[PDB]
């Protein structure tokens, strides 16, 4: 069975799900995904209103990527099934006059705040459109948004579903429903994220059901309120920012004008998703002793050109943290600054194994393999790489692709005798036979992970 239902019938959403779950999602694409989501919204700050909302976006979407298997589905399909790619969606808040008040305002900037308090979710001068649309210059794929609403307000959570909603518009094309009683393919996928992310959301008869549509009026005054609340200080500088971002125009990168959240604390603002004991990640406006933070771009800042995943961005300092790429990192970063690289004379990595100025060594398939050393590639930031754990000169294996291989250790007896460990799924796995080439690379030369990030050893690599 496998007819492509129309992008507005309810069992859409199954042909997601059943063609989504056909290409799991490995560790490392959801180490990639979630760095290209923190980018992606981090780049989206200029059209953003507050750090609020911009928090709540980031781990909303990462929380998703982590916990709900539903999630990793849909975002599967999307990059298999050609449509959009979950890194490349931005985000705006752009509000607009609310058509039943455009007889008295002619711009966003004449609405005054008390036009906006002494009024109700019908007629609220100041209105946003969630839609998954297009920015018609670039054809980037854009969501817009409300403001995030209070976190303990009640509202919050569904306001967190709407946007998984607009989101699964772009990665898998569906479509919303018109009929009577019927919630369509995109509300019923984003239903079952929110259902496995634990969120409470209303139910209502259909997708046009007018007690849903007066509900969502109500959620995004409320929403609009409380954000206001939030700036109770600088509301002069935070009107200025939402009439500039309403005009489609960027406003502050680093939220500049807005001070006021520092005072607020952690305790009211957006949390970041639960992670494993093994996860390195955390905030972007808050520090550990918590105090906050005025520098945006560190916590994305990449690491080098020649590290990055293909097709994809340059890693960042916590995606080498996340592989157990760390010693791999230090090593090749270590040769590519030194000496270089020198091309000896074996077909690939695998034909090499069985028959100061640090250098590295080029195969004639464009693989290559880079000094270790237990002295000065063993450390205490490369100490965390699972094969340290796990149980000294090493050659360390990259495929042609650039991708990493194998890491096989020696000590200075049975000169031979050592250990071998296969990189696979972002981790480094023990393999004790050392015949594992023979017994795992097959007649194949590639790597275990098809998704490992890049080491482009010499720069006429991003060419081929
Ligand atoms: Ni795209
Ligand atoms: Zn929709």
Redesign the pocket.
């Given at each position: 069975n496998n007819d492509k239902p129309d992008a507005s019938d309810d069992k859409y959403a199954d042909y997601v799900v059943r063609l989504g779950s056909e290409h799991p999602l490995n560790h490392t694409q959801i180490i990639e995904l979630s760095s290209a989501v923190s980018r992606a919204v981090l780049l989206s700050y200029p059209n953003i209103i507050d750090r609020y909302t911009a928090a709540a976006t980031e781990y909303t979407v990462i929380d998703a990527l982590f916990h709900s298997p539903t999630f990793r589905h849909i975002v599967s399909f999307g990059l298999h099934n050609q449509q959009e790619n979950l890194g490349h969606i931005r985000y705006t808040n752009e509000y607009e006059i609310n058509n039943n008040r455009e007889d008295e305002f002619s711009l966003v900037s004449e609405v005054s705040y008390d036009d906006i308090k002494s009024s109700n979710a019908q007629q609220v001068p100041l209105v946003a459109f969630?839609?998954?649309r297009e920015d018609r210059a670039t054809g980037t794929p854009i969501v817009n948004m409300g403001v995030a609403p209070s976190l303990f307000s009640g509202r919050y959570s569904w306001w967190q579903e709407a946007l998984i909603?607009?989101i699964?518009?772009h990665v898998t094309g569906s479509?919303?429903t018109h009929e009577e009683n019927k919630q369509?393919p995109?509300?019923i996928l984003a239903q079952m994220v929110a259902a496995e992310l634990h969120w409470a959301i209303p139910t209502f008869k259909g997708?046009s059901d007018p007690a849903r549509v007066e509900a969502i009026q109500e959620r995004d005054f409320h929403s609009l309120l409380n954000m206001f609340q939030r700036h109770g200080s600088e509301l002069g500088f935070l009107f200025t920012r939402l009439a500039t971002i309403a005009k489609g125009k960027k406003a502050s990168p680093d939220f500049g004008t807005l001070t006021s959240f520092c005072s607020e604390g952690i305790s009211s603002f957006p949390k970041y998703p639960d992670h494993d004991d093994d996860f390195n990640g955390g905030g972007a406006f808050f520090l550990p002793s918590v105090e906050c933070t005025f520098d945006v771009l560190n916590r994305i800042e990449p690491v080098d050109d020649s590290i990055k995943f293909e097709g994809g961005n340059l890693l960042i300092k916590n995606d080498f943290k996340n592989l157990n790429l760390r010693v791999a990192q230090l090593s090749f970063l270590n040769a590519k600054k030194g000496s270089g690289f020198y091309r000896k004379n074996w077909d690939s990595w695998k034909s090499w194994y069985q028959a100061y100025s640090p250098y590295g060594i080029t195969f004639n398939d464009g693989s290559f393999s880079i000094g270790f050393s237990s002295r000065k590639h063993i450390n205490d930031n490369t100490k965390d790489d699972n094969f340290v754990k796990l149980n000294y000169a090493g050659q360390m294996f990259f495929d042609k692709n650039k991708r990493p291989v194998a890491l096989v250790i020696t000590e200075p007896l049975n000169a031979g005798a050592g250990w071998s460990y296969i990189y696979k799924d972002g981790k480094w796995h023990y393999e004790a036979q050392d015949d594992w080439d023979q017994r795992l690379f097959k007649d194949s030369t590639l790597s275990l992970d098809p998704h490992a990030p890049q080491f482009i050893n010499l720069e006429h690599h991003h060419h081929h």
């Open positions: 969630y839609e998954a909603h607009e699964v518009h479509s919303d369509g995109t509300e997708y």
